[PDB]
Design a protein around this nucleic acid. Structure first.
Ligand SMILES: [K+]
Ligand SMILES: [K+]
Ligand SMILES: [K+]
Ligand SMILES: [K+]
Ligand SMILES: [K+]
Ligand SMILES: [K+]
Ligand SMILES: [K+]
Ligand SMILES: [K+]
Ligand SMILES: [K+]
Ligand SMILES: [K+]
Ligand SMILES: [K+]
Ligand SMILES: [K+]
Ligand SMILES: [K+]
Ligand SMILES: [K+]
Ligand SMILES: [K+]
Ligand SMILES: [K+]
Ligand SMILES: [K+]
Ligand SMILES: [K+]
Ligand SMILES: [K+]
Ligand SMILES: [K+]
Ligand SMILES: [K+]
Ligand SMILES: [Mg+2]
Ligand SMILES: [Mg+2]
Ligand SMILES: [Mg+2]
Ligand SMILES: [Mg+2]
Ligand SMILES: [Mg+2]
Ligand SMILES: [Mg+2]
Ligand SMILES: [Mg+2]
Ligand SMILES: [Mg+2]
Ligand SMILES: [Mg+2]
Ligand SMILES: [Mg+2]
Ligand SMILES: [Mg+2]
Ligand SMILES: [Mg+2]
Ligand SMILES: [Mg+2]
Ligand SMILES: [Mg+2]
Ligand SMILES: [Mg+2]
Ligand SMILES: [Mg+2]
Ligand SMILES: [Mg+2]
Ligand SMILES: [Mg+2]
Ligand SMILES: [Mg+2]
Ligand SMILES: [Mg+2]
Ligand SMILES: [Mg+2]
Ligand SMILES: [Mg+2]
Ligand SMILES: [Mg+2]
Ligand SMILES: [Mg+2]
Ligand SMILES: [Zn+2]
Lengths: 74, 48, 57, 134
RNA sequence: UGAUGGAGGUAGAGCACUGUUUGGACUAGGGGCCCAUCUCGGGUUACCGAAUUCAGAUAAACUCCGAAUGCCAUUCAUUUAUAUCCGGGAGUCAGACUGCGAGUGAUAAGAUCCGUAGUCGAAAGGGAAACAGCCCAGACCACCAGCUAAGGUCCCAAAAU
RNA sequence: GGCGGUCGCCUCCUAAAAGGUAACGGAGGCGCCCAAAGGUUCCCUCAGAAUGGUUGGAAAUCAUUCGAAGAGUGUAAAGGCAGAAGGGAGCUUGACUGCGAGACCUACAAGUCGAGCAGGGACGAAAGUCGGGCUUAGUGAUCCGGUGGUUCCGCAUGGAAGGGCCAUCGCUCAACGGAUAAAAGCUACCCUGGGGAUAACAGGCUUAUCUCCCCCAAGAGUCCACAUCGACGGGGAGGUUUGGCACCUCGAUGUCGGCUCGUCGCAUCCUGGGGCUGUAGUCGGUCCCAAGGGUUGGGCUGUUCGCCCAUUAAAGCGGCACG
RNA sequence: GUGGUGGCGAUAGCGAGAAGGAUACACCUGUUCCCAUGCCGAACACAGAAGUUAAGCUUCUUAGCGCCGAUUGUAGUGAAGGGUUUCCCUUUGUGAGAGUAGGACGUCGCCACG
């Protein structure tokens, strides 16, 4: 019989492009590297992308078919 | 039979670590070099 | 230059963004009028509720 | 007609909006029977139409069935209340949208083709029109 | 609301993957018959045909693609006037229908279950003969004054026989 | 309501391109595993196919070529990874201690990520990486107990007893936010509080089923689709059936059959009129019109129904809270 | 020109063909040396300069494949309505995928030897 489902995990983008964030702010929750960590951005043990410094978030292209998040301080 | 174990410090006898082992694959007591917070140094730790 | 906007249709039964647009423009009762600059922001608002308003230059 | 195997035993009924995605032109035969309304076509209906056509053609020429009943549908028996999970699969349907050519024929003179496709159309739950290949 | 920048794979579409599938060509291989039988090599039903290829379909749990919208954001712009936070006091945890998008159901139900907007609830007035939920519209009051909305204008019954 | 199913956690679809989102909706997994299948350093690239080749066979090992991933990634699925997260090897134990700016998630309790700082390390020449594993399941509050540690307390005082603090163990408390350390049934002998929030009767909505009526016409009918019948399929009407729903009624809407009294519909049983006939006649068949009237008494059974007996011009079918 | 080393979505690729080595880059010659092969100096490592451009590699030609891809039209769809309302239609904005005209056999740097 059916009738089961796991709790939803609230994945996806947590900070906006062009938004100023403090260091440590989570930018993107994901399974796998759907988006890659760019400049001043790290990737956690469960693929969460977080800011390493204070700066403005930019979602960028990584080559042809990949994306990327970076944080640029002012 | 995978079981939970404690790794005691062979120097000061502090039960410093919680870990687990498969007894079938590791019959003898697991021995590891682990940092002892009491002695503040890496010491031989053995399952007790 | 200027836009004279008059509320000609009721806001009852309309979505929230349209009621809030009417309020953002400063319109109240039906047939209430208001004069606004012909900015791109104001013209955008008129477009959102054009079915509810009449506008004059 | 029935698929030999299916990935999922049960499927949504779905929706039939718009004209058919593909198969709107006669592709293999000389004459086609075009659906002008959207409707589920059962495998029983496809078979009745097919036999009605071939027999009138007197085993002459070729017949192409351009639709397949990919989709299953379930039912609940009389006396069964609502709830307690989706019913067991009952039959197979092809969802057919207006403009889909359901059948094509070739190898027979036009007079026979027009009467062949007329007899088939009366077996289907959809209104139809004859279409000549271009 | 506008501008700008982003995330996201739905509608549609497509087949490049995975399932489902039609015809054609050709085919390893697969069925019986004879000659030859040590069952060893052939020749055939326009016998069944993998895979390949050509053409054509199909998909909630397929995707080479992919919107509209919605969403997040900006020391941004215009209009607008709310937002949070701290504390006192609650009530609410049976909802309904209508439109739209889905599931369940027989793409039955004034059915059921979500999403979304509205009205009812807790809203009188006008229209829909009557008719909570539809359409128009929100009653602080007075008037034997005027203009309109939906809907109307031969009589009941106001207004174009 | 019962029976069955379900109860916590993970992945997907549903879910409407942020997030979230229900149903006894559609599919699967979990209650672990690993001493490397962890860390690091260095190195490596797959599955298949074609061709050749002893045992050797479709397929075990070998060689070349082709091959962008069609493999693998312990374990479900999704997302990801071949600048590897896949594969091999050396050394290792960071599957470190104290923590932790800032975020995500969130009613709470919890859950998730985390740069960076210090202590002491592993690998590496160094850069640097390392606080387990491609990612997301593999779990359980408190109370009460066990064990280890402890510069804490010690009821006059020293001790002790007994506590505290830190670490860790004992949950299919799985009805998985766990009522108790400890618990199954019968009630037609029943009772109270409530509910049309919720069933049984009747109404209502629906019409799958049912009854009736049609479309197409392969066929049957010696020939001949359509006198009559009519496969495979298709479309309706009705609201008498079997059902679905739960909208009025549970501060009660009395339930089958019969009796009495009927009344209405017409999809007409008889009688009246008519067309076609595979209508000689007599009997009939079938369709059309027609609701004026008529439409039996018994045997059995509570029965309705039905079988039977004997009649009849006939002995119609339904509705009216199954009047 | 060649050899290093980078940025830019393959418009940078792939296949086919042609030319070149002065240097350079490679094949290449060896296992004494550090080091190496779950066997093999093939590789890795080291030492070397007889030969060769044959291959790689550079440059050049080709769009056959892959990649990029305007416009128009259409699907869908926001908003506002409508009907004969499981569907369909009008108005207004937006606008694909497909299929195509075409583009493209790269471009922008820095260093070294010429
Ligand atoms: K038809
Ligand atoms: K495909
Ligand atoms: K899809
Ligand atoms: K609704
Ligand atoms: K209101
Ligand atoms: K290792
Ligand atoms: K419980
Ligand atoms: K009793
Ligand atoms: K009906
Ligand atoms: K009828
Ligand atoms: K006849
Ligand atoms: K009652
Ligand atoms: K009666
Ligand atoms: K007659
Ligand atoms: K009568
Ligand atoms: K009797
Ligand atoms: K009796
Ligand atoms: K009753
Ligand atoms: K060498
Ligand atoms: K060469
Ligand atoms: K090219
Ligand atoms: Mg999920
Ligand atoms: Mg982890
Ligand atoms: Mg679609
Ligand atoms: Mg309802
Ligand atoms: Mg109320
Ligand atoms: Mg009212
Ligand atoms: Mg009332
Ligand atoms: Mg008048
Ligand atoms: Mg007139
Ligand atoms: Mg959405
Ligand atoms: Mg979402
Ligand atoms: Mg691994
Ligand atoms: Mg004392
Ligand atoms: Mg004492
Ligand atoms: Mg619970
Ligand atoms: Mg008794
Ligand atoms: Mg009582
Ligand atoms: Mg009551
Ligand atoms: Mg009720
Ligand atoms: Mg009643
Ligand atoms: Mg209800
Ligand atoms: Mg009463
Ligand atoms: Mg009649
Ligand atoms: Mg395009
Ligand atoms: Zn120690």
């Amino acid at each position: 019989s059916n009738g089961r489902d796991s709790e939803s995990k609230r994945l996806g983008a947590k900070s906006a492009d062009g938004q100023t964030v403090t260091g440590g702010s989570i930018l993107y929750r994901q399974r796998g590297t759907k988006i890659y960590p760019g400049v001043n951005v790290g990737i956690g043990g469960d693929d969460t992308l977080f800011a390493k410094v204070d700066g403005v978030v930019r979602f960028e292209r990584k080559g042809r078919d990949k994306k990327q998040v970076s944080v640029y301080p002012v | 039979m995978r079981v939970n174990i404690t790794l005691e410090c062979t120097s000061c006898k502090e039960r410093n670590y919680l870990t687990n082992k498969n007894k079938r694959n590791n019959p003898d007591r697991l021995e590891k070099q682990k940092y002892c917070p009491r002695e503040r140094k890496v010491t031989l730790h053995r399952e007790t | 230059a200027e836009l004279k906007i008059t509320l000609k249709r009721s806001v009852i039964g309309r979505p929230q963004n349209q009621r809030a647009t009417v309020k953002a423009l400063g319109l109240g009762k039906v047939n209430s009028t208001v004069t606004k600059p012909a900015n791109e922001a104001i013209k955008g608002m008129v477009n959102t509720i054009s079915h509810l308003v009449d506008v004059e230059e | 007609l029935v698929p030999k195997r299916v990935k999922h035993r049960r499927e949504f009924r779905g929706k039939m909006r718009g004209e058919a995605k593909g198969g709107k032109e006669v592709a293999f035969g000389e004459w086609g029977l075009q659906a002008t309304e959207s409707h589920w076509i059962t495998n029983r209906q496809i078979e009745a139409a097919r036999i009605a056509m071939t027999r009138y053609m007197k085993r002459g020429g070729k017949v192409w069935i351009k639709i397949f009943p990919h989709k299953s549908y379930t039912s609940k028996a009389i006396g069964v209340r609502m709830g307690k999970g989706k019913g067991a699969p009952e039959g197979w349907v092809s969802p057919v949208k207006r403009g889909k050519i359901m059948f094509e024929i070739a190898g027979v003179p036009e007079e026979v083709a027009r009467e062949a496709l007329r007899l088939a159309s009366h077996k289907l739950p959809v209104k139809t029109k004859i279409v000549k290949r271009e």
